[PDB]
Amino acid sequence: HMLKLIVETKTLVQSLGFASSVVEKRNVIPEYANIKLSAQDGNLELSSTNMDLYLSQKIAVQVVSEGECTVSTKTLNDIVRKLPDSELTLTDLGTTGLEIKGKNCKFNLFTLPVSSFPAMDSINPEASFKISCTDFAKIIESTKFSISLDETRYNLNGVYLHIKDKEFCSASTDGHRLSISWVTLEKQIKNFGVILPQKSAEEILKIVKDPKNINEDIEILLNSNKIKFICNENTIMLSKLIDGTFPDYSTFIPESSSSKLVINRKMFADSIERIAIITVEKFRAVKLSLSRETLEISAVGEARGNAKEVINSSQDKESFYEYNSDESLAIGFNPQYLEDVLKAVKSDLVELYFSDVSAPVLIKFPENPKDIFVVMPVKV
Amino acid sequence: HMLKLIVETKTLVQSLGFASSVVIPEYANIKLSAQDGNLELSSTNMDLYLSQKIAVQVVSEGECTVSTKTLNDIVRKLPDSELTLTDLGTTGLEIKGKNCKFNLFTLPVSSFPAMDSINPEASFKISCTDFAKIIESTKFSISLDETRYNLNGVYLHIKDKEFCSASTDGHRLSISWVTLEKQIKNFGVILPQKSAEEILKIVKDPKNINEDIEILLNSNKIKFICNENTIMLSKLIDGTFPDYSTFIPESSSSKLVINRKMFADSIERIAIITVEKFRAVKLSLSRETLEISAVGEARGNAKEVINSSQDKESFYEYNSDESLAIGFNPQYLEDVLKAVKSDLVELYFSDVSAPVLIKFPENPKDIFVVMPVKV
Numbered sequence A: 001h002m003l004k005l006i007v008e009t010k011t012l013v014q015s016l017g018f019a020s021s022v023v024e025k026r027n028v029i030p031e032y033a034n035i036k037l038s039a040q041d042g043n044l045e046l047s048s049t050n051m052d053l054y055l056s057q058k059i060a061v062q063v064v065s066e067g068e069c070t071v072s073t074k075t076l077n078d079i080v081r082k083l084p085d086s087e088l089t090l091t092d093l094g095t096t097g098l099e100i101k102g103k104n105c106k107f108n109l110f111t112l113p114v115s116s117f118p119a120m121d122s123i124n125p126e127a128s129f130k131i132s133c134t135d136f137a138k139i140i141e142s143t144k145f146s147i148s149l150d151e152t153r154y155n156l157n158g159v160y161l162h163i164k165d166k167e168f169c170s171a172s173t174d175g176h177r178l179s180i181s182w183v184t185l186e187k188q189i190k191n192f193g194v195i196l197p198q199k200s201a202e203e204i205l206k207i208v209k210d211p212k213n214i215n216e217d218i219e220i221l222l223n224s225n226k227i228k229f230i231c232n233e234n235t236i237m238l239s240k241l242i243d244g245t246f247p248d249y250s251t252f253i254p255e256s257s258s259s260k261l262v263i264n265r266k267m268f269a270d271s272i273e274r275i276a277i278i279t280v281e282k283f284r285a286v287k288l289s290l291s292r293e294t295l296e297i298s299a300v301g302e303a304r305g306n307a308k309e310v311i312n313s314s315q316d317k318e319s320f321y322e323y324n325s326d327e328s329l330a331i332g333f334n335p336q337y338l339e340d341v342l343k344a345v346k347s348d349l350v351e352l353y354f355s356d357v358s359a360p361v362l363i364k365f366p367e368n369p370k371d372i373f374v375v376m377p378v379k380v
Numbered sequence B: 001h002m003l004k005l006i007v008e009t010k011t012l013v014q015s016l017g018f019a020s021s022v023v024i025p026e027y028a029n030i031k032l033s034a035q036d037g038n039l040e041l042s043s044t045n046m047d048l049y050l051s052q053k054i055a056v057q058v059v060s061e062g063e064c065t066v067s068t069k070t071l072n073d074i075v076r077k078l079p080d081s082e083l084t085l086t087d088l089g090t091t092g093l094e095i096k097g098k099n100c101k102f103n104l105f106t107l108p109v110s111s112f113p114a115m116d117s118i119n120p121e122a123s124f125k126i127s128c129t130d131f132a133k134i135i136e137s138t139k140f141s142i143s144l145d146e147t148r149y150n151l152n153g154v155y156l157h158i159k160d161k162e163f164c165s166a167s168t169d170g171h172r173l174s175i176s177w178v179t180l181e182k183q184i185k186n187f188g189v190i191l192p193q194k195s196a197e198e199i200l201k202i203v204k205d206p207k208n209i210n211e212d213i214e215i216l217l218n219s220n221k222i223k224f225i226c227n228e229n230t231i232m233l234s235k236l237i238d239g240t241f242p243d244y245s246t247f248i249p250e251s252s253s254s255k256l257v258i259n260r261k262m263f264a265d266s267i268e269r270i271a272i273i274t275v276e277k278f279r280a281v282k283l284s285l286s287r288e289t290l291e292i293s294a295v296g297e298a299r300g301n302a303k304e305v306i307n308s309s310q311d312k313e314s315f316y317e318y319n320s321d322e323s324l325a326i327g328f329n330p331q332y333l334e335d336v337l338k339a340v341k342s343d344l345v346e347l348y349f350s351d352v353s354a355p356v357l358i359k360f361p362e363n364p365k366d367i368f369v370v371m372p373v374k375v
Helices: A009-022 A073-080 A133-141 A198-209 A265-276 A335-344 B009-022 B068-075 B128-136 B146-151 B193-204 B260-271 B330-337
Strands: A004-008 A034-040 A043-049 A053-060 A062-065 A067-072 A087-092 A098-101 A105-109 A127-132 A158-164 A167-173 A177-184 A193-197 A217-222 A226-231 A235-240 A259-264 A286-290 A294-301 A305-312 A321-323 A329-333 A349-354 A361-365 A368-375 B004-008 B029-035 B038-044 B048-055 B057-060 B062-067 B082-087 B093-096 B100-104 B122-127 B153-159 B162-168 B172-179 B188-192 B212-217 B221-226 B230-235 B254-259 B281-285 B289-296 B300-307 B316-318 B324-328 B344-349 B356-359 B366-370
Touching: A004 A009, A009 A043, A009 A053, A009 A073, A009 A087, A009 A198, A034 A062, A034 A073, A053 A198, A067 A073, A073 A098, A073 A105, A105 B260, A127 A133, A133 A167, A133 A177, A133 A198, A133 A217, A158 A198, A177 A335, A193 A198, A193 A235, A198 A226, A198 A235, A259 A265, A265 A286, A265 A294, A265 A305, A265 A335, A265 A349, A265 B100, A329 A335, A335 A368, B004 B009, B009 B038, B009 B048, B009 B068, B009 B082, B009 B193, B029 B057, B029 B068, B048 B193, B062 B068, B068 B093, B068 B100, B122 B128, B128 B162, B128 B172, B128 B193, B128 B212, B153 B193, B172 B330, B188 B193, B188 B230, B193 B221, B193 B230, B254 B260, B260 B281, B260 B289, B260 B300, B260 B330, B260 B344, B289 B316, B324 B330, B330 B366
Parallel strands: none
Antiparallel strands: A004 A062, A004 A087, A034 A043, A034 A067, A043 A053, A053 A235, A087 A098, A098 A105, A105 B300, A127 A217, A158 A167, A158 A193, A167 A177, A177 A368, A217 A226, A226 A235, A259 A321, A259 A349, A286 A294, A286 A329, A294 A305, A305 B100, A349 A361, A361 A368, B004 B057, B004 B082, B029 B038, B029 B062, B038 B048, B048 B230, B082 B093, B093 B100, B122 B212, B153 B162, B153 B188, B162 B172, B172 B366, B212 B221, B221 B230, B254 B316, B254 B344, B281 B289, B281 B324, B289 B300, B344 B356, B356 B366
């Protein structure tokens, strides 16, 4: 019937931060903005949903009376974050509302009937397996930034999660670049390939990176229509899948290269970002003028000016630069697309493999053999 | 001659921050003038003109003009401890670090306005600390209503030896003052909101806050010379400031003394439940307790109880056997409570429809009035 429970405030604040990262709040079209609270068997289950995903979080509380209700996510989040008490009492007071009670204060939040809150789908899986949260965060971190934002390219608006032999892999592309990242499974899993929407990839990454989950495991259960994540037993996320066919990306990886650059990753990344400052949105491009002696990174911006930075050949790790060719190469890239790759993998050095000015660059990190990136150039 | 100078990056970044908070097309530009060991950076908008001088190594004297935003964008991300600026003519202004070069389009200096001259009717000096105080205590209750343009600034005015800033938006009054030693000709002028905000930031800078500011004014313009090297000229709102003394209660029948932070934190919590259409908290005052409560249509309601206490950290004392339930916009109370750093705050009441007067003990030259709302 009527919920009543005592919960540690800090724990509730953390769960509501996750609820807040799910809940609909754009205020252009109708939204369902409530959170469902369910007290059962020593746990409070907090459920949040948007049109892409359903999140269920369970936290241990002192259940005085079992029950469920729903209230405004934002109002509950906003109040609980400002209460000083180490613990709070939550009591469903019926027409009076859900009461949030600390030592000196009481808030009544009007409820909405539980029947108004979307049903949690059941998932009957075709395949399921478990991997570490550390391994899953890695392949998502390495591929979430190059998802397409173009709705007409509906099959590119997510990450392609798939099995090839013993490798669990994530791939993403927006037509301008490709990212691929994988981890080796120990058990042979049924082959599958599904497209996880960007919004779900962002939320499940936040979940598995939480300190309580990052060193734990995540179970993945899926069929061709839906996917379920069970992260460290007590957090369940259900997601829709994008109905479509991810392209055969193996054709996109250059089979050979005419020159190779090795350079300190942070130095390269900092220089690109600096030089890109002069650019405008209508022409986001930096020019890499590569030679054995120096690399000149330059850019122009209409009605702003131009910019140039020189990186000299060097064998010191902190300033490393080596370009293995007697020939020069002047080739342009969108600096955001280079920065996305450079920030994705924490590595001392980075390798860039080129062919001609009109062909893509292949980017790899030396201690990271299971991450691959391809970026097409732009005319400069 | 062509400008060329070497400048400490951190000091140039700081100057460009002030120039950027100020910013016709030529008003998006910054004028750079290297002369006599100083770089003068000039910035202007339709209300004000700002001139800053910073010491640099002047290699060659000269002046030029560039986009404020482009210059600010580049300098704030260069890692070098010092930068070389060189007007290269057809190439533009060169901003040079150890390994990077930026060239910015320059614009003609003949297109950049000079700072207007002022013939002052009144001029005086006060400390930057005192000037910061009176602006800090009054900038939050300036009107944002364009239909009441004479309220869209602070009223800087003198009464005998008291130099006052006052502001009102029709819902509250803030007034803060400093006693001058010199006899100054009577004046009263309205400093626009953007100019009050900019000169406050300048006087609060660490290099100025312990120094002095000279104020020179007539009925059309006001000039601030802050610690010699930063000069801001501002237009004044041409108009008549209203008789704000009508906010001051003729008398008060009850008084609340309460811990300031405790009060502000409880108002802030209870106000969460309100909606934009009815931003109000209810204070139900009695000798034993204060109940702070609020309602929000289709959202809910809330209540917090504060018990009488003589402990400094939880202080509450209300001097009357009568109960008083009176409402306020919580933002107008929070504005006042955050304006003055004090352990306690005092609130003086009469009836539910009359204003509250607020003061902070040990701050006798700051007075605030907030009108109630029906609850």
